[PDB]
Amino acid sequence: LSRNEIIQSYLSRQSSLLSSSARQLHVLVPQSPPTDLPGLTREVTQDDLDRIQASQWPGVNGCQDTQGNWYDWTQCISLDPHGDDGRLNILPYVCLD
Amino acid sequence: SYSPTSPSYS
């Protein structure tokens, strides 16, 4: 368990950084006081069903991001939260093949 | 080295 060799330690940094990874960060989403079923008691409201299918809903159907680019659940978001060349890589939600 | 290979050795 001694490890601590400069080489052994250097491998640890690369492996850990790879798994993890001007703002280009997602738009802040605030409080959600009316939830569609329990919070607003608006179960089966037809506008909500229409909005989810085609309209852009910030958190039900996608992630807004900054710079305006809209990323849907199936798509993968590439963003750069730190001020460095390396960019965080959001992957897909539906991941539907 | 040479652990028993469930998938083939690379």
């Binding site: 590439s78 750069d80 960019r87 890589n89 897909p92 991941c95 | 998938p7």
Partner: protein, 112 residues
């Protein structure tokens, strides 16, 4: 009782998904008996959803179908058969999962 029958049959069908156990049975000559093919034909009741609801290891069902072709049991007595089938099974499994993950990650990193 019928409960013990159900439990033993479930365990046996879930165990059939093992190529090692299949090669075991094929070498020991259990497949050559005309009783085992009728038992397999009876075991097809697991295809129903109410019975498939209790199957923890689902990989067996497809395999079971192959056992009905009457050419799968004549072969598979070889150990290379179990080798190859387990190889392809584990390869499909692990490669599908990790390859989807790695492809997504690598494409996201390269496009940036």
């Amino acid at each position: 009782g019928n409960r013990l029958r159900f439990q033993l049959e479930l365990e046996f069908v879930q165990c059939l998904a093992n190529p090692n156990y299949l090669n075991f049975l094929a070498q020991r000559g259990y497949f050559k008996d005309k009783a085992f093919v009728n038992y397999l034909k009876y075991l097809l009741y697991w295809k129903d959803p109410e019975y498939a609801k209790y199957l923890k290891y689902p990989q067996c069902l497809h395999m079971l179908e192959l056992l009905q072709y009457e050419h799968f049991r004549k072969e598979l007595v070889n150990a290379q058969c179990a080798k190859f089938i387990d190889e392809q099974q584990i390869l499909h499994w692990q490669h599908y999962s990790r390859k989807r993950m790695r492809l997504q990650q690598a494409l996201a990193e390269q496009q940036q």
